[PDB]
PDB file of all heavy atoms in Angstrom:
ATOM      1  N   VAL A 497     195.416  20.911 -20.538  1.00 32.83           N
ATOM      2  CA  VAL A 497     195.376  22.348 -20.342  1.00 32.83           C
ATOM      3  C   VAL A 497     194.233  22.993 -21.158  1.00 32.83           C
ATOM      4  O   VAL A 497     193.985  22.611 -22.316  1.00 32.83           O
ATOM      5  CB  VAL A 497     196.697  23.017 -20.749  1.00 32.83           C
ATOM      6  CG1 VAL A 497     196.643  24.490 -20.517  1.00 32.83           C
ATOM      7  CG2 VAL A 497     197.806  22.424 -19.960  1.00 32.83           C
ATOM      8  N   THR A 498     193.537  23.946 -20.576  1.00 30.45           N
ATOM      9  CA  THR A 498     192.528  24.707 -21.307  1.00 30.45           C
ATOM     10  C   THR A 498     193.062  25.426 -22.550  1.00 30.45           C
ATOM     11  O   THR A 498     194.171  25.971 -22.520  1.00 30.45           O
ATOM     12  CB  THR A 498     191.817  25.706 -20.442  1.00 30.45           C
ATOM     13  OG1 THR A 498     190.914  26.433 -21.275  1.00 30.45           O
ATOM     14  CG2 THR A 498     192.800  26.661 -19.827  1.00 30.45           C
ATOM     15  N   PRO A 499     192.301  25.399 -23.651  1.00 27.87           N
ATOM     16  CA  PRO A 499     192.708  26.079 -24.895  1.00 27.87           C
ATOM     17  C   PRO A 499     192.863  27.599 -24.738  1.00 27.87           C
ATOM     18  O   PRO A 499     193.600  28.207 -25.504  1.00 27.87           O
ATOM     19  CB  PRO A 499     191.575  25.742 -25.867  1.00 27.87           C
ATOM     20  CG  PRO A 499     190.897  24.592 -25.296  1.00 27.87           C
ATOM     21  CD  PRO A 499     191.050  24.676 -23.819  1.00 27.87           C
ATOM     22  N   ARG A 500     192.231  28.172 -23.719  1.00 25.46           N
ATOM     23  CA  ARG A 500     192.270  29.631 -23.484  1.00 25.46           C
ATOM     24  C   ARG A 500     193.527  30.012 -22.738  1.00 25.46           C
ATOM     25  O   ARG A 500     193.568  31.066 -22.120  1.00 25.46           O
ATOM     26  CB  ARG A 500     191.125  30.127 -22.618  1.00 25.46           C
ATOM     27  CG  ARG A 500     189.827  29.372 -22.566  1.00 25.46           C
ATOM     28  CD  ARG A 500     188.765  30.344 -22.105  1.00 25.46           C
ATOM     29  NE  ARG A 500     187.621  30.486 -22.981  1.00 25.46           N
ATOM     30  CZ  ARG A 500     186.542  29.684 -22.962  1.00 25.46           C
ATOM     31  NH1 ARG A 500     186.492  28.657 -22.081  1.00 25.46           N
ATOM     32  NH2 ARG A 500     185.534  29.894 -23.810  1.00 25.46           N
ATOM     33  N   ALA A 501     194.552  29.181 -22.763  1.00 24.28           N
ATOM     34  CA  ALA A 501     195.732  29.485 -21.976  1.00 24.28           C
ATOM     35  C   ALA A 501     196.773  30.255 -22.807  1.00 24.28           C
ATOM     36  O   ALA A 501     196.896  30.018 -24.003  1.00 24.28           O
ATOM     37  CB  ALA A 501     196.346  28.175 -21.422  1.00 24.28           C
ATOM     38  N   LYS A 502     197.534  31.107 -22.130  1.00 29.44           N
ATOM     39  CA  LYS A 502     198.611  31.826 -22.782  1.00 29.44           C
ATOM     40  C   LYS A 502     199.933  31.225 -22.322  1.00 29.44           C
ATOM     41  O   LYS A 502     199.947  30.460 -21.371  1.00 29.44           O
ATOM     42  CB  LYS A 502     198.560  33.342 -22.445  1.00 29.44           C
ATOM     43  CG  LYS A 502     197.208  34.022 -22.747  1.00 29.44           C
ATOM     44  CD  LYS A 502     196.326  34.107 -21.493  1.00 29.44           C
ATOM     45  CE  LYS A 502     195.209  35.179 -21.647  1.00 29.44           C
ATOM     46  NZ  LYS A 502     194.417  35.361 -20.414  1.00 29.44           N
ATOM     47  N   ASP A 503     201.025  31.553 -23.006  1.00 29.47           N
ATOM     48  CA  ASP A 503     202.340  30.945 -22.763  1.00 29.47           C
ATOM     49  C   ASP A 503     202.827  31.099 -21.318  1.00 29.47           C
ATOM     50  O   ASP A 503     203.545  30.239 -20.826  1.00 29.47           O
ATOM     51  CB  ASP A 503     203.431  31.455 -23.732  1.00 29.47           C
ATOM     52  CG  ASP A 503     202.870  31.858 -25.095  1.00 29.47           C
ATOM     53  OD1 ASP A 503     201.987  31.138 -25.614  1.00 29.47           O
ATOM     54  OD2 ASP A 503     203.336  32.882 -25.657  1.00 29.47           O
ATOM     55  N   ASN A 504     202.516  32.222 -20.667  1.00 30.03           N
ATOM     56  CA  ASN A 504     202.886  32.368 -19.259  1.00 30.03           C
ATOM     57  C   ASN A 504     202.231  31.255 -18.425  1.00 30.03           C
ATOM     58  O   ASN A 504     202.948  30.518 -17.703  1.00 30.03           O
ATOM     59  CB  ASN A 504     202.508  33.743 -18.673  1.00 30.03           C
ATOM     60  CG  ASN A 504     201.129  34.212 -19.108  1.00 30.03           C
ATOM     61  OD1 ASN A 504     200.400  33.518 -19.809  1.00 30.03           O
ATOM     62  ND2 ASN A 504     200.759  35.428 -18.669  1.00 30.03           N
ATOM     63  N   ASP A 505     200.915  31.081 -18.557  1.00 31.57           N
ATOM     64  CA  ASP A 505     200.226  29.953 -17.918  1.00 31.57           C
ATOM     65  C   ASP A 505     200.849  28.579 -18.218  1.00 31.57           C
ATOM     66  O   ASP A 505     201.067  27.799 -17.303  1.00 31.57           O
ATOM     67  CB  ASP A 505     198.768  29.937 -18.349  1.00 31.57           C
ATOM     68  CG  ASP A 505     198.044  31.192 -17.902  1.00 31.57           C
ATOM     69  OD1 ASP A 505     198.636  31.885 -17.036  1.00 31.57           O
ATOM     70  OD2 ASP A 505     196.930  31.479 -18.401  1.00 31.57           O
ATOM     71  N   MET A 506     201.141  28.294 -19.484  1.00 29.30           N
ATOM     72  CA  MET A 506     201.771  27.026 -19.862  1.00 29.30           C
ATOM     73  C   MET A 506     203.071  26.846 -19.122  1.00 29.30           C
ATOM     74  O   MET A 506     203.431  25.727 -18.726  1.00 29.30           O
ATOM     75  CB  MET A 506     201.958  26.902 -21.370  1.00 29.30           C
ATOM     76  CG  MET A 506     200.668  26.928 -22.168  1.00 29.30           C
ATOM     77  SD  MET A 506     200.785  25.818 -23.582  1.00 29.30           S
ATOM     78  CE  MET A 506     201.671  24.382 -22.903  1.00 29.30           C
ATOM     79  N   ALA A 507     203.832  27.940 -18.966  1.00 27.64           N
ATOM     80  CA  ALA A 507     205.098  27.892 -18.282  1.00 27.64           C
ATOM     81  C   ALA A 507     204.874  27.586 -16.813  1.00 27.64           C
ATOM     82  O   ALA A 507     205.567  26.736 -16.197  1.00 27.64           O
ATOM     83  CB  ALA A 507     205.851  29.183 -18.448  1.00 27.64           C
ATOM     84  N   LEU A 508     203.908  28.278 -16.219  1.00 30.63           N
ATOM     85  CA  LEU A 508     203.538  28.085 -14.823  1.00 30.63           C
ATOM     86  C   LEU A 508     203.250  26.615 -14.537  1.00 30.63           C
ATOM     87  O   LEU A 508     203.896  25.953 -13.702  1.00 30.63           O
ATOM     88  CB  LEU A 508     202.344  28.929 -14.454  1.00 30.63           C
ATOM     89  CG  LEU A 508     201.919  28.747 -12.990  1.00 30.63           C
ATOM     90  CD1 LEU A 508     202.981  29.347 -12.153  1.00 30.63           C
ATOM     91  CD2 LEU A 508     200.572  29.367 -12.705  1.00 30.63           C
ATOM     92  N   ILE A 509     202.242  26.095 -15.269  1.00 33.29           N
ATOM     93  CA  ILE A 509     201.856  24.692 -15.285  1.00 33.29           C
ATOM     94  C   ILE A 509     203.029  23.739 -15.433  1.00 33.29           C
ATOM     95  O   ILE A 509     203.214  22.858 -14.619  1.00 33.29           O
ATOM     96  CB  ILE A 509     200.877  24.403 -16.440  1.00 33.29           C
ATOM     97  CG1 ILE A 509     199.527  25.059 -16.204  1.00 33.29           C
ATOM     98  CG2 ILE A 509     200.711  22.929 -16.616  1.00 33.29           C
ATOM     99  CD1 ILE A 509     198.640  24.981 -17.405  1.00 33.29           C
ATOM    100  N   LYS A 510     203.835  23.943 -16.468  1.00 34.05           N
ATOM    101  CA  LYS A 510     204.964  23.061 -16.691  1.00 34.05           C
ATOM    102  C   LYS A 510     205.837  22.966 -15.434  1.00 34.05           C
ATOM    103  O   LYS A 510     206.176  21.898 -14.978  1.00 34.05           O
ATOM    104  CB  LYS A 510     205.769  23.515 -17.894  1.00 34.05           C
ATOM    105  CG  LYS A 510     207.129  22.854 -18.081  1.00 34.05           C
ATOM    106  CD  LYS A 510     207.287  22.499 -19.563  1.00 34.05           C
ATOM    107  CE  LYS A 510     208.719  22.550 -20.046  1.00 34.05           C
ATOM    108  NZ  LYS A 510     209.645  21.847 -19.119  1.00 34.05           N
ATOM    109  N   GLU A 511     206.149  24.143 -14.866  1.00 35.95           N
ATOM    110  CA  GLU A 511     206.961  24.204 -13.663  1.00 35.95           C
ATOM    111  C   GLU A 511     206.351  23.457 -12.483  1.00 35.95           C
ATOM    112  O   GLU A 511     206.917  22.503 -11.966  1.00 35.95           O
ATOM    113  CB  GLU A 511     207.178  25.661 -13.242  1.00 35.95           C
ATOM    114  CG  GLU A 511     207.999  25.809 -11.961  1.00 35.95           C
ATOM    115  CD  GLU A 511     207.475  26.919 -11.024  1.00 35.95           C
ATOM    116  OE1 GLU A 511     206.432  27.542 -11.348  1.00 35.95           O
ATOM    117  OE2 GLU A 511     208.124  27.157  -9.962  1.00 35.95           O
ATOM    118  N   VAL A 512     205.181  23.902 -12.062  1.00 37.56           N
ATOM    119  CA  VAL A 512     204.495  23.317 -10.906  1.00 37.56           C
ATOM    120  C   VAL A 512     204.258  21.810 -11.056  1.00 37.56           C
ATOM    121  O   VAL A 512     204.634  21.027 -10.188  1.00 37.56           O
ATOM    122  CB  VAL A 512     203.109  24.004 -10.672  1.00 37.56           C
ATOM    123  CG1 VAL A 512     202.387  23.403  -9.494  1.00 37.56           C
ATOM    124  CG2 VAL A 512     203.309  25.465 -10.471  1.00 37.56           C
ATOM    125  N   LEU A 513     203.694  21.399 -12.174  1.00 37.39           N
ATOM    126  CA  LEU A 513     203.437  19.989 -12.409  1.00 37.39           C
ATOM    127  C   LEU A 513     204.686  19.161 -12.537  1.00 37.39           C
ATOM    128  O   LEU A 513     204.661  18.000 -12.190  1.00 37.39           O
ATOM    129  CB  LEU A 513     202.613  19.825 -13.661  1.00 37.39           C
ATOM    130  CG  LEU A 513     201.141  19.432 -13.581  1.00 37.39           C
ATOM    131  CD1 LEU A 513     200.425  20.287 -12.522  1.00 37.39           C
ATOM    132  CD2 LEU A 513     200.552  19.569 -14.986  1.00 37.39           C
ATOM    133  N   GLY A 514     205.768  19.729 -13.055  1.00 37.05           N
ATOM    134  CA  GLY A 514     206.980  18.959 -13.155  1.00 37.05           C
ATOM    135  C   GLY A 514     207.516  18.513 -11.801  1.00 37.05           C
ATOM    136  O   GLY A 514     208.336  17.588 -11.710  1.00 37.05           O
ATOM    137  N   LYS A 515     207.018  19.114 -10.723  1.00 38.48           N
ATOM    138  CA  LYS A 515     207.537  18.857  -9.381  1.00 38.48           C
ATOM    139  C   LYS A 515     206.931  17.579  -8.771  1.00 38.48           C
ATOM    140  O   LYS A 515     207.105  17.299  -7.579  1.00 38.48           O
ATOM    141  CB  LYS A 515     207.277  20.031  -8.482  1.00 38.48           C
ATOM    142  CG  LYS A 515     208.409  21.053  -8.529  1.00 38.48           C
ATOM    143  CD  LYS A 515     208.173  22.242  -7.592  1.00 38.48           C
ATOM    144  CE  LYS A 515     206.821  22.915  -7.883  1.00 38.48           C
ATOM    145  NZ  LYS A 515     206.684  24.191  -7.118  1.00 38.48           N
ATOM    146  N   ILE A 516     206.202  16.830  -9.600  1.00 37.18           N
ATOM    147  CA  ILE A 516     205.533  15.598  -9.175  1.00 37.18           C
ATOM    148  C   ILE A 516     206.174  14.382  -9.861  1.00 37.18           C
ATOM    149  O   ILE A 516     206.104  13.266  -9.339  1.00 37.18           O
ATOM    150  CB  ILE A 516     204.021  15.649  -9.488  1.00 37.18           C
ATOM    151  CG1 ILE A 516     203.393  16.869  -8.800  1.00 37.18           C
ATOM    152  CG2 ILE A 516     203.329  14.385  -9.018  1.00 37.18           C
ATOM    153  CD1 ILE A 516     201.863  16.966  -8.972  1.00 37.18           C
ATOM    154  N   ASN A 517     206.844  14.620 -10.971  1.00 40.05           N
ATOM    155  CA  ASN A 517     207.581  13.564 -11.647  1.00 40.05           C
ATOM    156  C   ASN A 517     208.512  12.862 -10.638  1.00 40.05           C
ATOM    157  O   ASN A 517     209.157  13.545  -9.847  1.00 40.05           O
ATOM    158  CB  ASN A 517     208.377  14.153 -12.807  1.00 40.05           C
ATOM    159  CG  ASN A 517     208.911  13.083 -13.746  1.00 40.05           C
ATOM    160  OD1 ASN A 517     208.679  11.908 -13.551  1.00 40.05           O
ATOM    161  ND2 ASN A 517     209.614  13.500 -14.786  1.00 40.05           N
ATOM    162  N   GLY A 518     208.464  11.528 -10.629  1.00 38.67           N
ATOM    163  CA  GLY A 518     209.334  10.685  -9.779  1.00 38.67           C
ATOM    164  C   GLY A 518     209.086  10.726  -8.272  1.00 38.67           C
ATOM    165  O   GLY A 518     209.944  10.342  -7.473  1.00 38.67           O
ATOM    166  N   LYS A 519     207.901  11.174  -7.879  1.00 38.44           N
ATOM    167  CA  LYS A 519     207.586  11.384  -6.484  1.00 38.44           C
ATOM    168  C   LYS A 519     206.601  10.352  -5.901  1.00 38.44           C
ATOM    169  O   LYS A 519     205.997   9.570  -6.631  1.00 38.44           O
ATOM    170  CB  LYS A 519     207.083  12.780  -6.316  1.00 38.44           C
ATOM    171  CG  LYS A 519     208.117  13.780  -5.875  1.00 38.44           C
ATOM    172  CD  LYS A 519     209.395  13.734  -6.673  1.00 38.44           C
ATOM    173  CE  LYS A 519     210.371  14.727  -6.128  1.00 38.44           C
ATOM    174  NZ  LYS A 519     209.710  16.104  -6.175  1.00 38.44           N
ATOM    175  N   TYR A 520     206.484  10.335  -4.578  1.00 39.95           N
ATOM    176  CA  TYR A 520     205.634   9.374  -3.889  1.00 39.95           C
ATOM    177  C   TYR A 520     204.394   9.982  -3.255  1.00 39.95           C
ATOM    178  O   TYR A 520     204.445  11.012  -2.598  1.00 39.95           O
ATOM    179  CB  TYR A 520     206.437   8.617  -2.850  1.00 39.95           C
ATOM    180  CG  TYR A 520     207.570   7.884  -3.470  1.00 39.95           C
ATOM    181  CD1 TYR A 520     208.852   8.434  -3.513  1.00 39.95           C
ATOM    182  CD2 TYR A 520     207.369   6.636  -4.035  1.00 39.95           C
ATOM    183  CE1 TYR A 520     209.903   7.743  -4.101  1.00 39.95           C
ATOM    184  CE2 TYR A 520     208.417   5.949  -4.617  1.00 39.95           C
ATOM    185  CZ  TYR A 520     209.686   6.488  -4.643  1.00 39.95           C
ATOM    186  OH  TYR A 520     210.728   5.766  -5.229  1.00 39.95           O
ATOM    187  N   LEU A 521     203.249   9.360  -3.465  1.00 39.56           N
ATOM    188  CA  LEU A 521     202.028   9.963  -2.996  1.00 39.56           C
ATOM    189  C   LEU A 521     201.242   8.938  -2.243  1.00 39.56           C
ATOM    190  O   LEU A 521     201.532   7.753  -2.355  1.00 39.56           O
ATOM    191  CB  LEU A 521     201.219  10.515  -4.159  1.00 39.56           C
ATOM    192  CG  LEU A 521     201.306  11.952  -4.609  1.00 39.56           C
ATOM    193  CD1 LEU A 521     202.698  12.307  -5.074  1.00 39.56           C
ATOM    194  CD2 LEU A 521     200.322  12.100  -5.742  1.00 39.56           C
ATOM    195  N   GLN A 522     200.202   9.361  -1.529  1.00 39.54           N
ATOM    196  CA  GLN A 522     199.281   8.430  -0.936  1.00 39.54           C
ATOM    197  C   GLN A 522     197.910   8.742  -1.488  1.00 39.54           C
ATOM    198  O   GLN A 522     197.546   9.887  -1.702  1.00 39.54           O
ATOM    199  CB  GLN A 522     199.322   8.499   0.587  1.00 39.54           C
ATOM    200  CG  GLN A 522     197.956   8.742   1.253  1.00 39.54           C
ATOM    201  CD  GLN A 522     197.182   7.469   1.407  1.00 39.54           C
ATOM    202  OE1 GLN A 522     197.719   6.385   1.256  1.00 39.54           O
ATOM    203  NE2 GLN A 522     195.881   7.570   1.683  1.00 39.54           N
ATOM    204  N   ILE A 523     197.140   7.668  -1.761  1.00 41.33           N
ATOM    205  CA  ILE A 523     195.776   7.784  -2.235  1.00 41.33           C
ATOM    206  C   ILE A 523     194.878   6.781  -1.564  1.00 41.33           C
ATOM    207  O   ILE A 523     195.236   5.607  -1.447  1.00 41.33           O
ATOM    208  CB  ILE A 523     195.659   7.531  -3.741  1.00 41.33           C
ATOM    209  CG1 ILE A 523     196.834   8.148  -4.493  1.00 41.33           C
ATOM    210  CG2 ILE A 523     194.299   7.994  -4.261  1.00 41.33           C
ATOM    211  CD1 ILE A 523     197.003   7.565  -5.891  1.00 41.33           C
ATOM    212  N   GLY A 524     193.685   7.200  -1.105  1.00 42.41           N
ATOM    213  CA  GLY A 524     192.706   6.243  -0.629  1.00 42.41           C
ATOM    214  C   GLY A 524     192.666   6.233   0.878  1.00 42.41           C
ATOM    215  O   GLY A 524     193.315   7.072   1.507  1.00 42.41           O
ATOM    216  N   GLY A 525     191.918   5.317   1.444  1.00 43.59           N
ATOM    217  CA  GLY A 525     191.844   5.170   2.895  1.00 43.59           C
ATOM    218  C   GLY A 525     192.989   4.310   3.466  1.00 43.59           C
ATOM    219  O   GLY A 525     193.872   3.839   2.726  1.00 43.59           O
TER     220      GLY A 525
END
């Protein structure tokens, strides 16, 4: 996370990014 972030941003990030834990993705050709 950028150092110029405020707690609202940190909260936003934590929420959105937490939605990838334990999930399945595809990468590549």
Side-chain angles (χ1 to χ4, degrees):
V497 181
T498 176
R500 334 202 126 84
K502 306 96 161 185
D503 330 319
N504 42 3
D505 297 347
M506 298 216 41
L508 179 69
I509 291 171
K510 169 136 148 47
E511 178 221 3
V512 179
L513 253 46
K515 271 181 306 188
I516 302 183
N517 194 1
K519 263 48 182 303
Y520 300 96
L521 265 63
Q522 126 82 15
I523 321 162

